[PDB]
Structure formats: structure tokens, C-alpha cells
Amino acid sequence: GSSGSSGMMIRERIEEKLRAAFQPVFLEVVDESYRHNVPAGSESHFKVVLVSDRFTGERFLNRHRMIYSTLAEELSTTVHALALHTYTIKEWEGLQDTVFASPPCRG
Numbered sequence: 425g426s427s428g429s430s431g432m433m434i435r436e437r438i439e440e441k442l443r444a445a446f447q448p449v450f451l452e453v454v455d456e457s458y459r460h461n462v463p464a465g466s467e468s469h470f471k472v473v474l475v476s477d478r479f480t481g482e483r484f485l486n487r488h489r490m491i492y493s494t495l496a497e498e499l500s501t502t503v504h505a506l507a508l509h510t511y512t513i514k515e516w517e518g519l520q521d522t523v524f525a526s527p528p529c530r531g
Contacts, residue, residue: 434502438495442474445494449513450475471507479510 435455442451454471458464472491479487487510492499499506511519 434499437498438472441494441498442491446474446476446478446490448474448476450511450516468503468505470503470505471509473509473511475511475513475516477513479512481512 433455435453439451439453442448450473452473454473456469474491478490488508491508491510
């Protein structure tokens with residue numbers, strides 16, 4: 425991006441970082457803008473998708489510790505809670521659809 429015209433959108437800052445942060449295979453963030461006029465200061469719906477092998481059924485918390493570390497403060501700035509969705513290559517290969525693959529075993 426040529427200098428000059430730029431923005432301060434969190435959604436971008438988040439990904440833009442992860443890109444080089446881990447350099448996974450998949451990346452997609454779901455940001456939600458203001459919907460109602462009234463002031464809302466209770467919760468901030470936010471979700472992020474990042475597929476990586478590193479999440480090979482290692483841990484449930486370790487999935488956040490790694491992410492947070494990157495956007496430790498970056499996110500803490502305005503965002504507080506986030507629903508991380510770390511998946512694996514396989515699981516992704518057939519998240520919804522599932523093929524009946526049950527090969528026989530050997531001695």
C-alpha cells in the first residue's frame with residue numbers, strides 16, 4: 425500500500441499482524457460495527473479464524489496464549505474478549521461434510 429491513504433481499522437491491524445506473526449494457511453476476522461444508536465458498553469461481539477497445524481490437538485488455552493501474545497495490547501486497546509477458532513488441516517478438510525472412511529487394521 426502506497427503511503428498517504430491509510431486507515432486505523434482494528435480488523436486489519438489484527439490480521440495484518442497474524443500474517444507475519446504465525447503465517448498460517450487460513451485467515452479471516454469477523455468485525456461488527458455499531459447497530460443501535462444507544463450507547464453499548466457491555467460486550468463487544470468479535471470472532472477470528474486462523475487455521476494452523478501448530479494447533480494439533482495441543483491444548484485449549486495454548487490456542488489463545490499464542491494469539492494474545494501477538495496482539496497483547498493491540499487488542500486490549502479497544503477489544504477485550506474474542507472467540508478464537510483454531511482448526512487443523514484435516515478437521516478443515518471435512519469440517520461439516522464427513523466421508524465414511526474406515527479402513528481395516530493390520531496385526
